[PDB]
């Protein structure tokens, strides 16, 4: 059930990721952003992920493919591997604590501009104790939400 709002999100979000705006996502584009997250994965991990998301394996990911990928990460969000990968990526400092500055840097580095409020909402809502930081336990619980 794709609503007009959701479709508009892809157009804006996709356009943000696609610098040239060719209507296609290359490895260099996604790879660059995927690396800016303070992570340094090998082409094998990236290519492998793309292939799993590329229903046709054309080497590039189209908007439609992204939608499918989302359903997987959103439906399997309860995957230890997915959570572990996200936790490590999010915690660039490997301190085991997620801050607003770190999160904002990650979610933003996605070619999107989020305000301190947005990030605060994610953490504030994820912070059970309201310590201003989200722990792995809180992350896992917030990674199961629909």
């Amino acid at each position: 059930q794709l609503t007009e709002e959701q479709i508009a999100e892809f157009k804006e979000a996709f356009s943000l990721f696609d610098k040239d705006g060719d209507g296609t996502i290359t490895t260099k584009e996604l790879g660059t952003v995927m690396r800016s997250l303070g992570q340094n994965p090998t082409e094998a991990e990236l290519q492998d992920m793309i292939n799993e998301v590329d229903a046709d394996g054309n080497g590039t990911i189209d908007f439609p493919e992204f939608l499918t990928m989302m359903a997987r990460k959103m439906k399997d969000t309860d995957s230890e591997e997915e959570i572990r990968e996200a936790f490590r990526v999010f915690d660039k400092d490997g301190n085991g604590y997620i801050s607003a500055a770190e999160l904002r840097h990650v979610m933003t580095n996605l070619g999107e501009k989020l305000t301190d409020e947005e990030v605060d909402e994610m953490i504030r809502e994820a912070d059970i104790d309201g310590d201003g930081q989200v722990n792995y336990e809180e992350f896992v619980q917030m990674m199961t939400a629909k």
Partner: peptide
């Protein structure tokens, strides 16, 4: 890639 969605979730609320 969930990262992309993560931004969309918050961004969607902002709009």
């Amino acid at each position: 890639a969930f990262i992309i969605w993560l931004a969309r979730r918050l961004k969607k609320g902002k709009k």
